[PDB]
């Protein structure tokens, strides 16, 4: 073969980029991407808190670098939003001293670097934010486009401004959370990593963004055991998720959450399931059941009826190709990461067996 | 009470509809019996961009026709030279779930966004060989369904929140908003008169906007189901539209109505992307059928097919000079047909 130096350099860039991509391919394949769904009364937030207890510590130096660039981007975006607001406002808010209006220029110039936050920028923005008239401008602009937690970043800046500093992960998560649209509520069990993706701050229609999640290893459909009447709407949400052409191949875990709240509702005897579901009068606790000690059989009959209603929908269509896996839980259950893991394993195994034709 | 407004709206809508029917003196398919059909179009996968990592969701050509961006829900925005198949850049993303990307008309910048409602802009003319976010043009309330650059300081974005929005990039404060749709908005296309951009609703309709006017000049509606993709005919006078209804449709602005449907009873799969050849004479559509169909834009002949994908076609693009047709499937493979 023959190349110019230009082609060779681009080929070495291509191979350098390839080696980088091949390193990321290992991280990608090693992560079980795992869409989370559930009507917001279903406490899916409280479920991801039971994942975040396993995510106790900052993920790695490479993840920490990725959030340093985000901390710096929100430091820059919050102070430049103020720097243009103090130009756009009708008050001639050139500072108390001309040096801050000169250092404002070298902020706009010095923010343009595709490298680490140099000590000059930190030195400028603390001297700016020391003027209480900037805190008053932050309260004048309180409903304009600004990062609402900017007063955290510009106060913590003192600790940010020097090499090898680390923030605690709730400051990072708080920095990132806005009108976000998803949350990547990461966790790991037995050194298996789940990028669980919650969907939230996102509009009432599913049928287009669901066509992203077609490759997630499983869908966790969290659903509220206790808010029957609403339950029948979630049963249609599950029926829709299940039959949807672009999810045909992906297995659904169900969490029947708020079991205890249903149990107390059933112990209260309101038993509106009989009204909302006449089939309850015919249905009875199957001998499949393995209840907890001290359950009222009615509580078993309720939970297993509801569960069997989801399973009925799961059984009616497509179950030749994708399973669904019910679990009974409450937000206190530490075992939820282990429940997710066991049936994530099963979903992968019971997928391989389709292609090894053992099924 | 709304009734009088719903009767007024009905009457206006009826007048608009009836006036269209009056202007529909003939179909396009009538007068194009003057036209020799295209020779049945043959193409081969004269490249495959094998090295992508997960399913490619979107792509866009650079105006130089040489480079193209592609983005995938592995979270890599990968920039390919179509000539050498060199991965000239591969840019990691602040969260993986892209749904769209675009190339600045200069080639200076690239953009993408997705279910994380954040748009981001990147500068390829780095000072130091590292590409990073120039600005994070956040502020939508739904997923950013499609981006296009008007200019290296102006970008329009669709959303699931029903709003198209134009951003002055340097300001980054939602510099115009075009709220008039219902449901999501799937896809955008810009005329060479970049003042005009069409956006496909996730209702049946398409709306034409003018960037300065800040509201829809027109609302085309011939489709039955969601418009998945949209593209101006190359002179800007007309635009194609794919739908989950499986039909392709061509609309002309001045006719304000459907000039030509493309369909077969064989083809139940929704169209997922559309674009024209440089002459406009070929309209290319990807499907849930992995085969692309190529249509004679004037004859409605299924003049050819591009079979060479093994999963849904996610996106399509024709170079500025019409030399070749990128197609991003839900395989990692981006195939450059020609």
């Amino acid at each position: 073969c023959t190349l110019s130096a230009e082609d060779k350099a681009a080929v070495e860039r291509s191979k350098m980029i390839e080696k980088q991509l091949q390193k990321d391919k290992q991280v990608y394949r090693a992560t079980h991407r795992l869409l989370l769904l559930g009507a917001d009364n279903s406490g899916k937030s409280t479920i991801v808190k039971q994942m975040r207890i396993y995510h106790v510590n900052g993920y790695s130096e490479e993840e920490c670098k990725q959030y340093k660039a985000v901390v710096y981007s929100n430091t820059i975006q919050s102070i430049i939003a103020i720097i243009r607001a103090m130009g756009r406002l009708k008050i001639d808010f050139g500072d108390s001293a001309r040096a801050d209006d000169a250092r404002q220029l070298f902020v706009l110039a010095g923010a343009a670097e595709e490298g680490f936050m140099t000590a000059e920028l930190a030195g400028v923005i603390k001297r700016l934010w020391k003027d209480s008239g900037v805190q008053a401008c932050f309260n004048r602009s309180r409903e304009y486009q600004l990062n609402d937690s900017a007063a955290y970043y510009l106060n913590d800046l003192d600790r940010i401004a020097q090499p090898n500093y680390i923030p605690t992960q709730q400051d990072v998560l708080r920095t990132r959370v806005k009108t976000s649209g998803i949350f990547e509520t990461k966790f790991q069990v037995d050194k298996v990593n789940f990028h669980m993706f919650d969907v939230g701050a996102q509009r009432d229609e599913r049928r287009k963004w669901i066509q992203c999640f077609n490759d997630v290893t499983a869908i966790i459909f969290v659903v509220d055991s206790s808010d029957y009447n609403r339950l029948q709407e979630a049963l249609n949400d599950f029926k829709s998720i299940w039959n949807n052409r672009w999810l045909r191949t992906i297995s659904v875990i169900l969490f029947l959450n708020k079991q205890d709240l249903l149990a107390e509702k059933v112990l209260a005897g309101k038993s509106k399931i009989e009204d909302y579901f006449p089939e309850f009068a015919r249905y009875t606790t199957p001998e499949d059941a393995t209840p907890e000690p001290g359950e009222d059989p009615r509580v078993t009959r309720a939970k297993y009826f509801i569960r069997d209603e989801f399973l009925r929908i799961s059984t009616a269509s497509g179950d030749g190709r994708h399973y669904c896996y019910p679990h009974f839980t409450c937000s206190v259950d530490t075992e939820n990461a282990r429940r997710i893991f066991n049936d994530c394993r099963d979903i992968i195994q019971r997928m391989h067996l389709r292609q090894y034709e053992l099924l | 009470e709304l009734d009088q407004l719903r009767q007024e709206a009905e009457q206006l809508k009826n007048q608009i509809r009836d006036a269209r029917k009056a202007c529909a003196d003939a179909t396009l398919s009538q007068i194009t019996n003057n036209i020799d059909p295209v020779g049945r179009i043959q193409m081969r996968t004269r490249r495959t961009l094998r090295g992508h990592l997960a399913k490619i969701y979107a792509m866009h050509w650079g105006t130089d026709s040489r480079l193209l961006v592609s983005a995938s829900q592995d979270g890599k925005l990968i920039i390919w030279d179509s000539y050498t198949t060199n991965k000239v850049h591969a840019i990691p993303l602040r969260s993986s779930w892209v749904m769209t990307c675009a190339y600045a008309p200069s080639g200076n910048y690239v953009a993408c966004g997705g279910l994380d409602n954040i748009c981001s802009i990147y500068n390829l003319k780095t000072r130091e060989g590292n590409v990073r976010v120039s600005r994070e043009l956040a502020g939508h309330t739904g997923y950013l369904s499609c981006c296009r650059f008007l200019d290296d300081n102006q970008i329009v974005t669709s959303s699931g929140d029903t709003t198209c929005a134009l951003w002055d990039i340097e300001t980054g404060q939602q510099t115009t908003t075009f709220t008039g749709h219902t449901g999501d908005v799937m896809s955008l296309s810009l005329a060479p008169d970049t003042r005009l951009f069409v956006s496909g609703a996730c209702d049946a309709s398409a709306k034409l906007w003018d960037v300065r006017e800040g509201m829809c000049r027109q609302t085309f509606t011939g489709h039955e189901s969601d418009i998945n993709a949209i593209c101006f005919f190359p002179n800007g006078n007309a635009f194609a539209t794919g739908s989950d209804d499986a039909t392709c449709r061509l609309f002309d602005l001045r006719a304000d109505q459907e000039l030509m449907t493309y369909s077969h009873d064989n083809i139940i799969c929704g169209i997922t992307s559309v674009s024209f050849s440089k002459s406009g004479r070929l309209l290319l559509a990807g499907y849930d059928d992995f085969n692309c169909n190529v249509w004679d834009a004037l004859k409605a002949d299924r003049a050819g097919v591009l079979a060479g994908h093994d999963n849904r076609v996610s996106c399509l693009g024709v170079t500025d000079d019409g030399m070749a047709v990128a197609t991003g499937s839900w395989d990692s493979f981006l195939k450059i047909w020609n």
Partner: nanobody
Framework: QVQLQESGGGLVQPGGSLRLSCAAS????????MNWVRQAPGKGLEWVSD????????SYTGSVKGRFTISRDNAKNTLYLQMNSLKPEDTAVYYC?????????????????????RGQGTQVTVSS
């Protein structure tokens, strides 16, 4: 183009019976699964009933199994809802809702607020 109009609502006595109907236009109706969806006071958009393209596959919300019945005519491009043994809480705006896309089982979004392929609704009052 795509245009829907519900009909046959109004006041009716509790325990009474009534047929709603919907005329659908501007699309090939036989290709679509069809739904009735209701907005009572305080409730959200509850899915009430659905009918397949064939008219054969059918289901109902559990509080409406047997009490109502749904049917369609693929030639007349129309959807009917027979209602019987009406409970006062069945008082709602009833909407004819198409599933989003043709040849589907799927039927997402028919209960979503601001959804496209749903009519103007007909009010039904179950009261005396």
């Amino acid at each position: 183009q795509v245009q829907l109009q519900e009909s046959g609502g109004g006041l009716v006595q509790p325990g009474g019976s009534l047929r709603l109907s919907c005329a659908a236009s501007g699309f090939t109706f036989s290709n679509y699964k069809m739904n009735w969806v209701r907005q009572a006071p305080g409730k959200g958009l509850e899915w009430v009933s659905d009918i397949s393209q064939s008219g054969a596959s059918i289901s109902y919300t559990g509080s409406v199994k047997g009490r109502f019945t749904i049917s369609r005519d693929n030639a007349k491009n129309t959807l009917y809802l027979q209602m019987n043994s009406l409970k006062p809480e069945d008082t709602a705006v009833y909407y004819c809702a198409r599933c989003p896309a043709p040849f589907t089982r799927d039927c997402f979004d028919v209960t979503s607020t601001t959804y496209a392929y749903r009519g103007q609704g007909t009010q039904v009052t179950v009261s005396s």
